[PDB]
Amino acid sequence: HKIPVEADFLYAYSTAPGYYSWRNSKDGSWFIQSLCAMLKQYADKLEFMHILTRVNRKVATEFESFSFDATFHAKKQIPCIVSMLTKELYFYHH
Amino acid sequence: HKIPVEADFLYAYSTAPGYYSWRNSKDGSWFIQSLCAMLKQYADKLEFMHILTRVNRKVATEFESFSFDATFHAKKQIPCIVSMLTKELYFYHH
Amino acid sequence: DEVX
Amino acid sequence: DEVX
Amino acid sequence: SGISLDNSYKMDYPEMGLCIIINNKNFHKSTGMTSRSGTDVDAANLRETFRNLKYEVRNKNDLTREEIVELMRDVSKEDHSKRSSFVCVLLSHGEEGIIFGTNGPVDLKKITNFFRGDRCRSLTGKPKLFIIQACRGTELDCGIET
Amino acid sequence: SGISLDNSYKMDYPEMGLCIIINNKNFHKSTGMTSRSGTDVDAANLRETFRNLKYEVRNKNDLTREEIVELMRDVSKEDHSKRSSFVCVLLSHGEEGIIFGTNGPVDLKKITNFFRGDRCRSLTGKPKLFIIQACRGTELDCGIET
């Protein structure tokens, strides 16, 4: 007869807890670039957690930083999906 | 050619960040009771994030605390799925 | 019911 | 590449 | 009728819902935060993507911490009864649990609390999506070769 | 051959993998932590569930903080080359980011760091699952009627 007040939230974070997040000054952020590409290709096909799983794989495999500073060079990123949802989410309907 | 060192982890937390988690002294914890029931019914059928989504709905809808202490009475819980996975996970194969 |  |  | 299941959110209300995009690029000098080059590319990509999903998109640029909290309060007091869902995107500097306005920080929990099941009743039972492009601290991942 | 896709983890190695269950029920008196009645029901349910999924289950009871860290270190130094995945379940008292041994706390990051892609090479590319039944602070959710 009641539901928790924290239920039905989804947090799609660009990086893991404690880490920097990367942005390219010409192309945009690694995570938003990848999120928009996967929504365009799969929003009429796949449930939203499976779309965000393909965003995790794209960010983790296709990007690596380039810097003249050794401390910031050749670094990697993995986004972090945090779900308190109680049902499947599809952007289309019948 | 590289992957992030934090990739391919999944954290299935019993409750949301900052909150207590509930356990019944006769039946076991709300979250583990519900996790085992949904794995038994759906591990040969559904991808693991969709199994954990049904665990979120069971905990949020079917349990509520009972206490003689007003501070702890009639309270609710929502578990928290944190995914850094880069592929779909099925417990069965072909 | 008890808390962890 | 820059950080946020 | 026949057999009916309830495993997915209802997404055929008359409207898909609002998509609020907060794009912070330039910060007050006294904060010492740098300009976020590339973020207008992100904001434009998101507006076109959520437009094609039939969301009502609203774009906001360079907001102070006071302006962010007043925007979120007012949006949570609208009537969302004919909307299926809610989406908010935050583009800014950050640390663990925090997002920056142009003149200082805002706790993320302060923002999401306006949308709690008990405080925004026309969104109770409906999915609330927060998308966050911001730092969560200062660690760097060195990777491992595959 | 024909067209091939790579969207799911390979789960047909010769073994499914290890399932480690750490069940802390009774705590040292000086810590002031209460006994966790009901947790043996949980530990038995998990052993039967993961047995039916063909995991090699190992159950451990009432471990100190020192014993938890030595167990995790030694397991991360085994050869997992013929295993598809890794599962660890923690049943104990806790706070945000922390799990308790019978005589004091352990940071969760200390435990998961032994399994990082660069430090456990026979699990690189394979799913690592951590299931955590423990408190994450002292807030209580009052709910909202539907």
Side-chain angles (χ1 to χ4, degrees):
Chain A
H1 74 135
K2 306 193 303 193
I3 60 166
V5 303
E6 300 278 7
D8 302 308
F9 285 81
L10 182 123
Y11 308 92
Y13 293 94
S14 62
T15 196
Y19 283 79
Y20 284 118
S21 187
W22 284 94
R23 161 171 51 74
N24 185 273
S25 49
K26 164 185 160 5
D27 311 316
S29 73
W30 298 359
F31 176 60
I32 303 300
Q33 266 179 257
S34 298
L35 173 64
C36 293
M38 295 297 84
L39 287 170
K40 258 159 247 327
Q41 175 179 1
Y42 295 115
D44 50 358
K45 289 193 215 359
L46 296 191
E47 196 272 332
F48 192 38
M49 295 307 90
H50 292 176
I51 298 169
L52 290 181
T53 298
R54 284 173 192 250
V55 180
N56 282 4
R57 189 165 75 242
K58 191 179 183 83
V59 178
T61 55
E62 301 193 349
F63 300 80
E64 184 179 301
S65 69
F66 180 85
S67 183
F68 301 137
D69 180 353
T71 294
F72 285 85
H73 179 65
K75 302 304 183 191
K76 301 289 291 186
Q77 188 173 309
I78 182 72
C80 177
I81 305 155
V82 181
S83 176
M84 280 70 139
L85 301 182
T86 61
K87 304 187 181 171
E88 290 168 22
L89 210 195
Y90 300 86
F91 290 105
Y92 60 94
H93 70 269
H94 295 322
Chain B
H1 74 135
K2 306 193 303 193
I3 60 166
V5 303
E6 300 278 7
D8 302 308
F9 285 81
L10 182 123
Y11 308 92
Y13 293 94
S14 62
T15 196
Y19 283 79
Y20 284 118
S21 187
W22 284 94
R23 161 171 51 74
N24 185 273
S25 49
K26 164 185 160 5
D27 311 316
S29 73
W30 298 359
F31 176 60
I32 303 300
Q33 266 179 257
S34 298
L35 173 64
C36 293
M38 295 297 84
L39 287 170
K40 258 159 247 327
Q41 175 179 1
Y42 295 115
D44 50 358
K45 289 193 215 359
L46 296 191
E47 196 272 332
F48 192 38
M49 295 307 90
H50 292 176
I51 298 169
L52 290 181
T53 298
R54 284 173 192 250
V55 180
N56 282 4
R57 189 165 75 242
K58 191 179 183 83
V59 178
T61 55
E62 301 193 349
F63 300 80
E64 184 179 301
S65 69
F66 180 85
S67 183
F68 301 137
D69 180 353
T71 294
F72 285 85
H73 179 65
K75 302 304 183 191
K76 301 289 291 186
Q77 188 173 309
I78 182 72
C80 177
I81 305 155
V82 181
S83 176
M84 280 70 139
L85 301 182
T86 61
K87 304 187 181 171
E88 290 168 22
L89 210 195
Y90 300 86
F91 290 105
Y92 60 94
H93 70 269
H94 295 322
Chain C
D1 294 319
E2 308 188 333
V3 295
Chain D
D1 294 319
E2 308 188 333
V3 295
Chain E
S1 46
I3 312 321
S4 83
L5 317 169
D6 71 299
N7 291 316
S8 68
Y9 287 110
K10 171 167 160 91
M11 294 292 295
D12 68 320
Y13 281 81
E15 310 171 27
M16 284 296 280
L18 304 188
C19 176
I20 307 304
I21 302 170
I22 303 186
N23 185 34
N24 280 355
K25 179 157 141 219
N26 306 291
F27 296 80
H28 295 193
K29 40 268 126 220
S30 290
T31 67
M33 290 186 272
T34 60
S35 289
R36 296 180 56 259
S37 300
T39 190
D40 296 334
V41 178
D42 280 358
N45 203 358
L46 291 155
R47 180 184 182 73
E48 178 68 10
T49 295
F50 284 92
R51 181 184 78 84
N52 278 321
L53 292 173
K54 309 315 167 160
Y55 280 87
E56 178 185 345
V57 178
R58 302 173 191 172
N59 274 76
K60 291 319 258 171
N61 297 134
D62 290 343
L63 301 188
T64 58
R65 68 187 178 208
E66 293 91 358
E67 284 163 337
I68 285 172
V69 170
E70 311 287 284
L71 175 58
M72 252 65 255
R73 187 187 276 112
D74 296 341
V75 170
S76 76
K77 287 194 213 284
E78 299 186 12
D79 182 2
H80 304 260
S81 291
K82 310 225 176 102
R83 303 175 180 159
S84 302
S85 65
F86 177 69
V87 178
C88 177
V89 186
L90 307 166
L91 318 169
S92 194
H93 292 291
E95 295 182 290
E96 186 65 59
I98 281 169
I99 189 83
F100 278 94
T102 55
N103 60 340
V106 184
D107 296 336
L108 284 167
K109 205 70 178 158
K110 184 172 186 54
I111 295 159
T112 56
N113 278 349
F114 295 114
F115 300 90
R116 270 164 51 138
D118 54 342
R119 301 187 187 163
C120 184
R121 292 304 263 113
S122 48
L123 288 168
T124 309
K126 299 173 180 181
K128 299 161 277 277
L129 314 190
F130 290 80
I131 294 166
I132 305 145
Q133 167 59 47
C135 284
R136 298 179 78 194
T138 56
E139 295 185 60
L140 293 165
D141 191 316
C142 65
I144 183 61
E145 284 140 55
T146 62
Chain F
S1 46
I3 312 321
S4 83
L5 317 169
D6 71 299
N7 291 316
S8 68
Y9 287 110
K10 171 167 160 91
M11 294 292 295
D12 68 320
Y13 281 81
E15 310 171 27
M16 284 296 280
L18 304 188
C19 176
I20 307 304
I21 302 170
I22 303 186
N23 185 34
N24 280 355
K25 179 157 141 219
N26 306 291
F27 296 80
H28 295 193
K29 40 268 126 220
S30 290
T31 67
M33 290 186 272
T34 60
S35 289
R36 296 180 56 259
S37 300
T39 190
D40 296 334
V41 178
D42 280 358
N45 203 358
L46 291 155
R47 180 184 182 73
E48 178 68 10
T49 295
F50 284 92
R51 181 184 78 84
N52 278 321
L53 292 173
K54 309 315 167 160
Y55 280 87
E56 178 185 345
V57 178
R58 302 173 191 172
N59 274 76
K60 291 319 258 171
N61 297 134
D62 290 343
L63 301 188
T64 58
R65 68 187 178 208
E66 293 91 358
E67 284 163 337
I68 285 172
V69 170
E70 311 287 284
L71 175 58
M72 252 65 255
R73 187 187 276 112
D74 296 341
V75 170
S76 76
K77 287 194 213 284
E78 299 186 12
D79 182 2
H80 304 260
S81 291
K82 310 225 176 102
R83 303 175 180 159
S84 302
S85 65
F86 177 69
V87 178
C88 177
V89 186
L90 307 166
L91 318 169
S92 194
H93 292 291
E95 295 182 290
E96 186 65 59
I98 281 169
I99 189 83
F100 278 94
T102 55
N103 60 340
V106 184
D107 296 336
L108 284 167
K109 205 70 178 158
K110 184 172 186 54
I111 295 159
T112 56
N113 278 349
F114 295 114
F115 300 90
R116 270 164 51 138
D118 54 342
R119 301 187 187 163
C120 184
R121 292 304 263 113
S122 48
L123 288 168
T124 309
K126 299 173 180 181
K128 299 161 277 277
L129 314 190
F130 290 80
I131 294 166
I132 305 145
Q133 167 59 47
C135 284
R136 298 179 78 194
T138 56
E139 295 185 60
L140 293 165
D141 191 316
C142 65
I144 183 61
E145 284 140 55
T146 62

Coordinates of all heavy atoms in Angstrom, one line a residue, chain F residues 19-70:
Chain F
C19 N 31.8 -18.9 -5.6 CA 30.9 -18.1 -4.9 C 31.4 -18.1 -3.4 O 31.2 -19.1 -2.8 CB 29.5 -18.5 -5.0 SG 28.2 -17.6 -4.0
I20 N 32.0 -17.0 -2.9 CA 32.4 -16.9 -1.5 C 31.4 -16.3 -0.7 O 31.0 -15.1 -1.0 CB 33.7 -16.1 -1.5 CG1 34.8 -16.6 -2.4 CG2 34.3 -16.0 0.0 CD1 35.2 -18.1 -2.2
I21 N 30.9 -16.9 0.4 CA 29.8 -16.3 1.3 C 30.4 -16.0 2.6 O 30.8 -16.9 3.3 CB 28.6 -17.2 1.4 CG1 27.9 -17.5 0.0 CG2 27.6 -16.6 2.3 CD1 26.8 -18.6 0.0
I22 N 30.5 -14.8 3.1 CA 31.0 -14.4 4.4 C 29.9 -14.0 5.3 O 29.2 -13.0 5.1 CB 32.1 -13.3 4.3 CG1 33.3 -13.6 3.4 CG2 32.6 -12.9 5.7 CD1 34.4 -12.6 3.5
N23 N 29.6 -14.8 6.3 CA 28.4 -14.7 7.2 C 28.8 -14.3 8.6 O 29.3 -15.2 9.4 CB 27.8 -16.1 7.2 CG 26.4 -16.2 8.0 OD1 25.7 -15.2 8.0 ND2 26.2 -17.3 8.6
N24 N 28.7 -13.0 8.9 CA 29.1 -12.6 10.3 C 27.9 -12.4 11.2 O 27.1 -11.5 11.0 CB 30.0 -11.4 10.3 CG 31.4 -11.7 9.9 OD1 31.8 -12.8 9.8 ND2 32.3 -10.7 9.7
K25 N 27.7 -13.3 12.2 CA 26.6 -13.3 13.1 C 26.9 -12.8 14.5 O 26.1 -12.1 15.0 CB 26.1 -14.8 13.1 CG 24.9 -14.9 14.1 CD 24.0 -16.1 13.7 CE 23.5 -16.8 15.0 NZ 23.5 -18.3 14.9
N26 N 28.0 -13.2 15.0 CA 28.4 -12.9 16.4 C 29.6 -12.0 16.5 O 30.7 -12.4 15.9 CB 28.6 -14.2 17.2 CG 27.5 -15.2 17.2 OD1 26.4 -14.9 17.8 ND2 27.7 -16.3 16.6
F27 N 29.6 -10.9 17.2 CA 30.7 -10.0 17.2 C 31.4 -9.9 18.6 O 30.8 -10.2 19.6 CB 30.1 -8.6 16.8 CG 29.6 -8.6 15.4 CD1 28.4 -9.2 15.1 CD2 30.4 -8.1 14.4 CE1 27.9 -9.3 13.8 CE2 29.9 -8.2 13.1 CZ 28.7 -8.8 12.7
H28 N 32.7 -9.5 18.6 CA 33.3 -9.4 19.9 C 32.6 -8.4 20.8 O 32.1 -7.3 20.4 CB 34.8 -9.0 19.8 CG 35.7 -10.0 19.1 ND1 37.0 -9.9 19.1 CD2 35.4 -11.1 18.3 CE1 37.6 -10.9 18.4 NE2 36.6 -11.7 17.9
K29 N 32.5 -8.8 22.1 CA 31.8 -8.0 23.1 C 32.3 -6.5 23.2 O 31.5 -5.6 23.3 CB 32.0 -8.6 24.5 CG 33.4 -9.2 24.7 CD 33.4 -10.6 24.3 CE 34.5 -11.0 23.2 NZ 34.0 -11.9 22.2
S30 N 33.6 -6.3 23.1 CA 34.1 -5.0 23.2 C 33.7 -4.0 22.0 O 33.7 -2.8 22.2 CB 35.7 -5.0 23.2 OG 36.1 -5.5 24.4
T31 N 33.2 -4.6 20.9 CA 32.8 -3.8 19.8 C 31.4 -3.2 20.1 O 31.0 -2.2 19.5 CB 32.6 -4.5 18.5 OG1 31.5 -5.4 18.6 CG2 33.9 -5.2 18.1
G32 N 30.6 -3.8 21.0 CA 29.3 -3.4 21.2 C 28.3 -3.6 20.1 O 27.2 -3.0 20.1
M33 N 28.6 -4.5 19.1 CA 27.6 -4.8 18.0 C 26.7 -6.0 18.4 O 27.1 -7.0 18.9 CB 28.4 -5.1 16.8 CG 29.1 -3.8 16.2 SD 29.9 -4.1 14.6 CE 31.5 -4.7 15.2
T34 N 25.4 -5.9 18.0 CA 24.5 -7.0 18.4 C 24.6 -8.2 17.5 O 25.1 -8.1 16.4 CB 23.0 -6.5 18.4 OG1 22.7 -6.1 17.0 CG2 22.8 -5.4 19.3
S35 N 24.1 -9.3 17.9 CA 24.0 -10.5 17.1 C 23.0 -10.4 16.0 O 21.9 -9.9 16.2 CB 23.7 -11.7 18.1 OG 24.9 -12.0 18.8
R36 N 23.3 -11.0 14.8 CA 22.4 -10.7 13.7 C 21.5 -11.9 13.5 O 21.6 -12.7 12.5 CB 23.3 -10.4 12.4 CG 24.1 -9.2 12.5 CD 25.0 -8.8 11.3 NE 24.1 -8.8 10.1 CZ 24.0 -9.7 9.2 NH1 24.7 -10.9 9.3 NH2 23.2 -9.6 8.2
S37 N 20.4 -12.0 14.3 CA 19.5 -13.1 14.2 C 18.8 -13.2 12.8 O 18.3 -12.2 12.3 CB 18.4 -13.0 15.3 OG 19.0 -13.1 16.6
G38 N 18.8 -14.4 12.2 CA 18.2 -14.6 10.9 C 19.2 -14.8 9.8 O 19.0 -15.2 8.7
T39 N 20.5 -14.4 10.1 CA 21.5 -14.4 9.0 C 21.8 -15.9 8.6 O 22.2 -16.1 7.5 CB 22.7 -13.6 9.4 OG1 23.6 -13.5 8.2 CG2 23.6 -14.4 10.4
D40 N 21.7 -16.9 9.5 CA 22.0 -18.3 9.0 C 20.9 -18.8 8.0 O 21.2 -19.6 7.1 CB 22.0 -19.2 10.2 CG 23.2 -19.0 11.1 OD1 24.2 -18.4 10.7 OD2 23.1 -19.3 12.3
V41 N 19.7 -18.3 8.1 CA 18.7 -18.5 7.1 C 19.1 -18.0 5.7 O 19.0 -18.7 4.7 CB 17.3 -17.9 7.5 CG1 16.3 -18.1 6.4 CG2 16.9 -18.5 8.8
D42 N 19.6 -16.7 5.7 CA 20.2 -16.1 4.5 C 21.3 -16.9 3.9 O 21.4 -17.2 2.7 CB 20.7 -14.7 4.7 CG 19.7 -13.6 4.8 OD1 18.4 -13.8 4.6 OD2 20.1 -12.4 5.0
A43 N 22.3 -17.3 4.7 CA 23.5 -18.0 4.2 C 23.1 -19.4 3.6 O 23.7 -19.8 2.6 CB 24.5 -18.2 5.4
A44 N 22.1 -20.1 4.2 CA 21.7 -21.4 3.7 C 20.9 -21.2 2.4 O 21.1 -22.1 1.5 CB 20.8 -22.2 4.7
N45 N 20.1 -20.2 2.3 CA 19.4 -19.9 1.0 C 20.3 -19.6 -0.1 O 20.2 -20.1 -1.2 CB 18.4 -18.8 1.3 CG 17.2 -18.7 0.4 OD1 17.0 -19.5 -0.5 ND2 16.3 -17.7 0.6
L46 N 21.4 -18.8 0.2 CA 22.3 -18.5 -0.9 C 23.1 -19.7 -1.4 O 23.4 -19.8 -2.5 CB 23.3 -17.4 -0.4 CG 22.7 -16.0 -0.2 CD1 23.5 -15.2 0.8 CD2 22.6 -15.3 -1.5
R47 N 23.6 -20.5 -0.5 CA 24.3 -21.7 -0.8 C 23.5 -22.6 -1.7 O 24.0 -23.1 -2.8 CB 24.8 -22.5 0.5 CG 25.6 -23.7 0.3 CD 25.8 -24.3 1.7 NE 26.6 -25.6 1.7 CZ 27.9 -25.6 1.5 NH1 28.6 -24.5 1.3 NH2 28.6 -26.7 1.5
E48 N 22.2 -22.8 -1.5 CA 21.4 -23.7 -2.3 C 21.1 -23.0 -3.7 O 21.1 -23.7 -4.7 CB 20.1 -24.0 -1.6 CG 19.2 -24.9 -2.5 CD 19.6 -26.3 -2.8 OE1 20.6 -26.8 -2.2 OE2 18.9 -26.9 -3.6
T49 N 20.9 -21.7 -3.7 CA 20.6 -21.0 -4.9 C 21.8 -21.0 -5.9 O 21.7 -21.3 -7.1 CB 20.2 -19.5 -4.6 OG1 19.0 -19.6 -3.8 CG2 20.0 -18.7 -5.8
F50 N 23.0 -20.7 -5.4 CA 24.2 -20.7 -6.3 C 24.7 -22.1 -6.6 O 25.3 -22.3 -7.6 CB 25.3 -19.8 -5.7 CG 24.9 -18.3 -5.9 CD1 24.3 -17.5 -5.0 CD2 25.3 -17.6 -7.1 CE1 24.0 -16.2 -5.2 CE2 25.0 -16.3 -7.3 CZ 24.3 -15.6 -6.4
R51 N 24.4 -23.1 -5.7 CA 24.7 -24.5 -6.1 C 23.9 -24.9 -7.4 O 24.4 -25.6 -8.2 CB 24.3 -25.5 -5.0 CG 24.6 -26.9 -5.3 CD 24.1 -27.8 -4.1 NE 22.6 -28.0 -4.2 CZ 22.0 -28.9 -4.9 NH1 22.6 -29.8 -5.7 NH2 20.7 -29.0 -4.8
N52 N 22.6 -24.4 -7.4 CA 21.8 -24.8 -8.6 C 22.2 -24.1 -9.8 O 21.9 -24.5 -10.9 CB 20.3 -24.6 -8.2 CG 19.8 -25.8 -7.4 OD1 20.1 -26.9 -7.7 ND2 19.0 -25.5 -6.4
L53 N 23.0 -23.0 -9.7 CA 23.5 -22.3 -10.9 C 24.9 -22.8 -11.3 O 25.5 -22.3 -12.2 CB 23.6 -20.8 -10.5 CG 22.2 -20.0 -10.4 CD1 22.4 -18.6 -9.9 CD2 21.5 -20.1 -11.7
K54 N 25.4 -23.8 -10.6 CA 26.6 -24.5 -10.8 C 27.9 -23.8 -10.4 O 29.0 -24.0 -10.9 CB 26.8 -25.0 -12.2 CG 25.6 -25.8 -12.9 CD 25.0 -26.8 -11.9 CE 23.7 -27.3 -12.5 NZ 23.2 -28.6 -12.0
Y55 N 27.8 -22.9 -9.4 CA 29.0 -22.2 -8.7 C 29.6 -23.2 -7.7 O 28.8 -23.9 -7.1 CB 28.6 -20.9 -8.1 CG 28.5 -19.8 -9.1 CD1 27.3 -19.5 -9.8 CD2 29.6 -19.0 -9.4 CE1 27.2 -18.5 -10.8 CE2 29.5 -17.9 -10.4 CZ 28.3 -17.8 -11.0 OH 28.2 -16.8 -12.0
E56 N 30.9 -23.1 -7.5 CA 31.7 -23.8 -6.4 C 31.5 -22.9 -5.2 O 32.2 -21.9 -5.1 CB 33.1 -24.0 -6.9 CG 34.1 -24.6 -5.9 CD 35.5 -24.6 -6.3 OE1 35.9 -24.5 -7.5 OE2 36.4 -24.9 -5.4
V57 N 30.6 -23.3 -4.2 CA 30.4 -22.3 -3.1 C 31.3 -22.6 -2.0 O 31.5 -23.8 -1.6 CB 28.9 -22.4 -2.7 CG1 28.7 -21.5 -1.5 CG2 27.9 -22.1 -3.8
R58 N 31.8 -21.5 -1.3 CA 32.6 -21.7 -0.1 C 32.0 -20.9 1.0 O 31.9 -19.6 0.9 CB 34.1 -21.4 -0.2 CG 34.8 -22.2 -1.3 CD 36.2 -21.7 -1.4 NE 36.9 -22.2 -2.6 CZ 38.1 -21.9 -3.1 NH1 38.7 -20.9 -2.6 NH2 38.5 -22.5 -4.2
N59 N 31.6 -21.4 2.1 CA 30.9 -20.6 3.2 C 31.9 -20.4 4.3 O 32.5 -21.3 4.8 CB 29.7 -21.3 3.7 CG 28.4 -21.1 3.0 OD1 28.1 -21.7 2.0 ND2 27.5 -20.3 3.6
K60 N 32.0 -19.1 4.8 CA 32.9 -18.8 5.9 C 32.1 -18.1 7.0 O 31.3 -17.2 6.6 CB 34.1 -17.9 5.5 CG 35.1 -18.6 4.6 CD 35.3 -20.0 5.1 CE 36.6 -20.2 5.9 NZ 36.7 -21.5 6.5
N61 N 32.2 -18.4 8.3 CA 31.5 -17.8 9.4 C 32.3 -17.1 10.4 O 33.4 -17.5 10.8 CB 30.8 -19.0 10.1 CG 29.7 -19.7 9.3 OD1 29.6 -20.9 9.3 ND2 28.8 -19.0 8.6
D62 N 31.8 -15.9 10.9 CA 32.4 -15.2 12.0 C 33.9 -14.9 11.8 O 34.7 -15.3 12.6 CB 32.1 -15.8 13.3 CG 30.6 -15.8 13.8 OD1 29.8 -15.1 13.3 OD2 30.3 -16.6 14.7
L63 N 34.3 -14.1 10.7 CA 35.7 -13.8 10.5 C 36.1 -12.4 11.0 O 35.3 -11.4 10.9 CB 35.9 -13.7 9.0 CG 35.7 -15.0 8.2 CD1 36.2 -14.9 6.7 CD2 36.4 -16.2 8.9
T64 N 37.3 -12.2 11.5 CA 37.8 -11.0 12.0 C 38.2 -10.1 10.8 O 38.3 -10.7 9.7 CB 39.1 -11.1 12.9 OG1 40.1 -11.8 12.1 CG2 38.9 -11.9 14.1
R65 N 38.5 -8.8 11.0 CA 38.9 -8.0 9.9 C 40.2 -8.5 9.3 O 40.3 -8.4 8.0 CB 39.0 -6.5 10.4 CG 40.1 -6.2 11.3 CD 40.0 -4.8 11.8 NE 41.1 -4.5 12.8 CZ 41.2 -3.7 13.8 NH1 40.2 -2.9 14.2 NH2 42.3 -3.7 14.6
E66 N 41.1 -9.0 10.1 CA 42.3 -9.6 9.5 C 42.1 -10.8 8.7 O 42.7 -10.9 7.6 CB 43.3 -9.9 10.7 CG 43.8 -8.7 11.4 CD 42.9 -8.2 12.6 OE1 41.9 -8.7 12.9 OE2 43.3 -7.2 13.2
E67 N 41.2 -11.7 9.1 CA 40.8 -12.9 8.4 C 40.1 -12.5 7.1 O 40.3 -13.3 6.1 CB 39.9 -13.8 9.2 CG 40.7 -14.6 10.3 CD 39.8 -15.2 11.4 OE1 38.7 -14.8 11.7 OE2 40.3 -16.2 12.1
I68 N 39.3 -11.5 7.0 CA 38.6 -11.1 5.8 C 39.6 -10.7 4.8 O 39.5 -11.2 3.6 CB 37.5 -10.0 6.1 CG1 36.3 -10.6 6.8 CG2 37.1 -9.3 4.8 CD1 35.3 -9.4 7.2
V69 N 40.5 -9.8 5.1 CA 41.5 -9.3 4.2 C 42.5 -10.5 3.7 O 42.8 -10.6 2.5 CB 42.3 -8.2 4.7 CG1 43.5 -7.8 3.9 CG2 41.4 -6.9 4.9
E70 N 42.9 -11.4 4.6 CA 43.7 -12.5 4.1 C 43.0 -13.5 3.2 O 43.5 -14.1 2.3 CB 44.3 -13.2 5.3 CG 45.0 -12.3 6.3 CD 46.3 -11.7 5.8 OE1 47.3 -12.4 5.8 OE2 46.3 -10.5 5.4

